[PDB]
Assembly symmetry: C3
Homo-oligomer: 459 residues x 3
């Protein structure tokens, strides 16, 4: 009897799992919302600088209307290589945002110290790929909480806590090509291996080098470390980048996983839309919503409040035609990156509606218990939309100057709804509904144009 080759099967469940970390794929936790869980780990936050500028350039006539296609190709070529390194070193990519990604090595506490070494090595080999746009890496380690929120058809997750705040702080101090360790990371790490320099007015440190002792063999050490990695591809599957590539059909699991992915992506996965339809440079309105709490590291407090805000946000977005693209913790608060005008989702008066939706969200969320401040930034223009990452691990994301602008507005103008000039001028709303604002110097924004507060219909 023959023993024919088994072909890779690219079932819809496997395709869906590309869009999600192991934390979710193999999580098997309750369908109740909010759901919280607690663990320890090391985080890596990898940022590619210069892609948002490249984004603007890919709109120019030189790209002959194939800007989006060229941008996603060059971005994915570079991001794919980073993803491969993270996965080979045993990390779980949690999320992509723009040209940045966040990865997790979940371990028990006793193994944090060794795993930090692995992650440092990984992070130095990532810098290598590009020594030959810059990459910056922040690392943190310690306690981590996960929150899963949503309704009967949609799910979102995020990670929370001091390590999560730390990893974003660390990445923001990095220069071109630094690997920065949070203070707790530096304190938990194997200091006999790792040569650092202090960072000015900072407790975080910079890695100069990995200097292992005489008898040290990284491959044997890494092997020891795989004992603690639940899903590291092994044995018959050691040629795979993810165990999730072996997932088999299972309707209950697929029903649970699909809730995390946008309907237009599921349409492509189901071979009901061309695989190229979602890469585009298109005019949209970004509504960037930030919620601040008394204590943002405390999942049992903030988890219900986020769920409550979520329930309202999704109902107003449904009505005024928008989508939540991403949710994550910023240095301050839980942020919802919302988009009006995604592929196949393009209402008329998109701008007016973005502004009224923002106001509704603002008024409702301001009265949710435990939410201290709501801030919303609204900006409109041409943004890149597309699936970013590796074949085995990728997500739909948005990149562009107006995305960055909406995020900076919500942080620099807290407690109000602000909009840019495009939104102001193109809205069908009377001028006294706005207030023209003082110009602020904003980290990473060349010249915003005039900014406005959306004051609303009365007062």
């Amino acid at each position: 009897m023959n023993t024919p080759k088994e072909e890779f099967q690219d079932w819809p469940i496997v395709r869906i799992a590309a869009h999600l970390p192991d934390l979710i794929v193999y999580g098997h936790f309750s369908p109740e919302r909010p759901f919280m869980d607690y663990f320890d780990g090391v985080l890596m936050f990898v940022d590619i600088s210069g892609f948002t500028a490249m984004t603007e350039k890919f709109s120019s006539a030189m790209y002959m209307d194939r800007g989006a296609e060229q941008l996603v190709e060059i971005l994915n070529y570079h991001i794919s290589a980073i993803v491969e390194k993270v996965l080979i070193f045993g990390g779980d990519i949690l999320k992509f945002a723009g040209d940045a990604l966040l990865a997790l090595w979940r371990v028990e506490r006793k193994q944090l110290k060794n795993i930090i070494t692995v992650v440092i090595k990984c992070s130095l080999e990532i810098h290598g790929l590009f020594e030959t746009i810059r990459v910056k890496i922040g690392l943190a380690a310690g306690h981590i909480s996960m929150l899963v929120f949503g309704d009967e058809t949609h799910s979102h997750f995020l990670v929370i806590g001091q390590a999560v705040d730390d990893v974003r702080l660390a990445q923001n101090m990095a220069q071109m090509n630094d690997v920065i360790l949070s203070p707790n990371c530096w304190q938990l790490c194997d200091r006999s291996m790792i040569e650092i320099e202090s960072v000015p007015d900072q407790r975080a440190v910079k890695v100069n080098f990995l200097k292992p002792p005489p008898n040290f063999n990284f491959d044997e050490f890494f092997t020891k470390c795989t004992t603690f990695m639940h899903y590291y591809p092994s044995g018959e599957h050691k040629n795979l980048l993810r165990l999730a590539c072996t997932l088999k059909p299972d309707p209950e699991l697929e029903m649970s996983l699909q809730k995390y992915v946008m309907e237009s992506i599921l349409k492509q996965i189901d071979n009901k839309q061309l695989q190229g339809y979602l890469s585009e440079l298109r005019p949209v309105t970004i509504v960037f919503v930030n919620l601040m709490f008394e204590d943002q590291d405390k999942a049992e407090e903030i988890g219900p409040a986020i769920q409550d805000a979520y329930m309202h946000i999704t109902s107003v977005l449904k009505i005024f035609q928008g989508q939540i693209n991403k949710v994550f913790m910023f240095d301050k608060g839980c942020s919802f990156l919302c988009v009006f005008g995604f592929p196949g989702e393009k209402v008329p008066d998109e701008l007016t509606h973005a502004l009224e939706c923002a106001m509704d969200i603002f008024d409702f969320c301001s009265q949710v218990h435990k939410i201290q401040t709501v801030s919303i930034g609204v900006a409109s223009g041409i943004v890149f939309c597309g699936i970013v990452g590796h074949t085995v691990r990728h997500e739909y994301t948005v990149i562009g100057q107006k995305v960055n602008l909406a995020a900076r507005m919500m942080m620099y103008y807290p407690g109000i709804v602000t909009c840019d000039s495009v939104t102001y001028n193109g809205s069908n709303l009377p001028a006294y509904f706005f207030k023209e604002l003082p110009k602020k110097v904003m980290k990473g924004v060349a010249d915003s144009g005039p900014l406005y507060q959306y004051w609303g219909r009365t007062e």
Copy 2:
């Protein structure tokens, strides 16, 4: 000089051949119609129970409008495994219908006894895959006739004879997980290998076990058996599941093979339609036509009558917009599973037209020489439509409660055109065109709702 790898070529002829058995692919018989041929073999009829119930469940809100996609994934995952086993054991899959399939091992008479052993083993290994919805297996052996019928643009085939009737009888007696042998099968088989129990009021037997003698080696025995298998992948091609995967372009052959496949499938094969467009849960009307003959095992009699009925059926289906999905022998007669509303084929007043088409077919077929009785069942509702099977061997098929209902109506209400309540109520026809019928208890139907005879315009 280099010797670069030859890539699998997935020519349109190869894609077309996935939809057909070797019996047709390598048949090279005359284009005249009807065409009949005669041979001997073993048949296996494998039924997956519980898929039509699963079908109903995949319509519920929990599947979030991806019911069809989830159903076809889970069905194909399981059916694919069965197909692989059949193919590795040297069988030719003849046809899929719903969640059931029919396979053939064509051999010369002297080899029936050994080949039965191979098929029994195959059938026990199929039961294995699922011990870890149930599968039931009927086996038969003996004389088999093939009939090919059609016109200049379309071809259909079916198998006929006592073995074919036997294999369906055998499969209907099976409990969850039985392998049942027809009486002739049991009589031709190697009784020193095979432990059976009798079945009550039945000459068919149930296989308890394969108990081979001391010196027996299944792999050596199977090798001996491959001498008699014309198309068993071998040598350079022993890694392939089908020789048909090596078919090369040949316009004359492709013109002959395409006539068996529906135009919408050929559109997908030709990369002119998305590969996901044909998996759907959609409202259709099933018109299930049964023709009974004096002697249904006698191809030279029934073949012309089937061709004559076919010519008329296809002309009325063209006019009132319907398709023949499948044709096969039932316990009694030749059945045409006809469908109104397939993908891209959805007329208005679909129901009225289904009923007038049914009446036309009934009146014409009743006067075809040798057709003793015509019976037609008409039912409408949501049915699963899609390509079922393995990558290398699959077919378009329909599954659902209304498919089963139309088949049961035509068997339990012989000699008339019957319809369900959906059809009755939604037709644009006056009520006295119908007769409300006595309720019958029907094998495999929970509660049909009221049933009607379509009496027609006069009387």
Copy 3:
């Protein structure tokens, strides 16, 4: 740590490079236009006879509206095999036209003699594939010039010179299965290896056989010859048919390469159109423009004139809705194969506009310095359009009796604009705008129907 398999990456740059020779892919020359360069090499011109007749036959009812799909399948099956041989023997396929292709082995002068041997062998192994429609092969060797012309969004190239004229002359003398050598080829070749017969009234010769001396080993000789082949896949990439399959994203390079490929092809490459949409048998109008010069072998003279004509042609084609499918040197002159009605490009009054565009091109090009004669043939009917070649090397092309007719009209009726009867009769133009022409016997045309000169609006 695992070392997972790297998957073939099928980036858009790689897909674009399939449509272009190495001469362009790895050319890295200036964006100024015209650009000329000069080198030496051997050319092979391979013609498949009988495909244009097959084309007509694939329109018949027997192909059941899948003529185009069947034609492209059978053509590509055969052409692919020829492409593989050319590539394995180290050639660069420059261009496909219809069922013919032109290949280049670029080498330094001292190596012409050995390389001719390699090309002869290649050409005899191509004849072999089909001894088991005919192939004819013309070979030439010597000085070659390349011209690149175009504007800011589009680029075209062609090769020019005595060797290029020679290779077309040689291929036109060939009978079924001859390999013919240009006179210069025969003079530069290793005459101790190659047995020839003279050809009547011709200095070109026919190859009867390769007869290598005792100590000769073709594989060792070929290896020596690879020293001179810049891009021969080797080492880690020796399993590849083209080095271009390893191209990595590079926006500057992709911007330069995409200018050679039609927008509808780039749409398919970008997964924004189904991969089957461009294979069709469709009614179009061919406008075949020939420009003759005093000296057609002299790139520095003719290159500016071609660029000047190009600039005007492309502006009139944009306005009256047409496309340049191909440009190449004929026995006499530079020819532009222009098409009205390509996929997605189908204006109404296509015929009138084809004729006015032809007149505009004629009047303008006649006054370009160095262009001695302009001749334009216009014919309309059903032509095959599609991507022809191998997966790794293919191009969009048109095949059909009306393509051949337009080419023959422009050569047999020099110095005027001519049209066929379909164009004449279907144009919305008055009859005195035409002159009915004497019938000429035209190489390769059965019966043209009446032919007309487009005289134009006055005189």
